[PDB]
Amino acid sequence: TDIDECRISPDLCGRGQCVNTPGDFECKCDEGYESGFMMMKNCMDIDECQRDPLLCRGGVCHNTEGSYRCECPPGHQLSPNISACI
Ligand SMILES: [Ca+2]
Ligand SMILES: [Ca+2]
């Protein structure tokens, strides 16, 4: 058992780094990519709208790839990536 799940491919995480584990494996995504376990185990931007309890707490969280956009919308004082309209 405990085979090389990282050897399967170099882009296993589609960005991060595939790790090895007993009867299983993991990955080390990049920026904000979250293991695309829903598809396999690649890199699929996390839920920036959930990573922070203040994120667009009073605006809009347009979670995007390897990042997220916050909208009060503009005209106010919403943090670019700090999470919290102002
Ligand atoms: Ca293994
Ligand atoms: Ca994201």
Swiss-Prot record:
Substitution effect: residue 6 to Y: In MFS; severe neonatal
Residues represented out of the complete protein: 1069 to 1154 of 2871
Name of the gene: FBN1
Compartments (UniProt record): Secreted
Species of origin: Homo sapiens
Post-translational modification: Cleavage of N- and C-terminus by furin is required for incorporation into the extracellular matrix and assembly into microfibrils. The C-terminus, which corresponds to the Asprosin chain, was initially thought to constitute a propeptide. Fibrillin-1 and Asprosin chains are still linked together during the secretion from cells, but are subsequently separated by furin, an essential step for incorporation of Fibrillin-1 into the nascent microfibrils. O-glycosylated on serine residues by POGLUT2 and POGLUT3 which is necessary for efficient protein secretion.
Effect of residue 6 to R: In MFS; severe neonatal
Family under the similarity heading: Belongs to the fibrillin family.
Residue ranges constituting the EGF-like domain according to the UniProt record: 2-44, 45-86
Lineage summary: Eukaryota, Metazoa, Chordata, Craniata, Vertebrata
Effect of residue 59 to S: In MFS; mild form
Glycosylated position list: 67, 81
Cysteine disulfide links: 6-18, 13-27, 29-43, 49-61, 56-70, 72-85
Disease field: Marfan syndrome: A hereditary disorder of connective tissue that affects the skeletal, ocular, and cardiovascular systems. A wide variety of skeletal abnormalities occurs with Marfan syndrome, including scoliosis, chest wall deformity, tall stature, abnormal joint mobility. Ectopia lentis occurs in most of the patients and is almost always bilateral. The leading cause of premature death is progressive dilation of the aortic root and ascending aorta, causing aortic incompetence and dissection.
Protein known as: Fibrillin-1
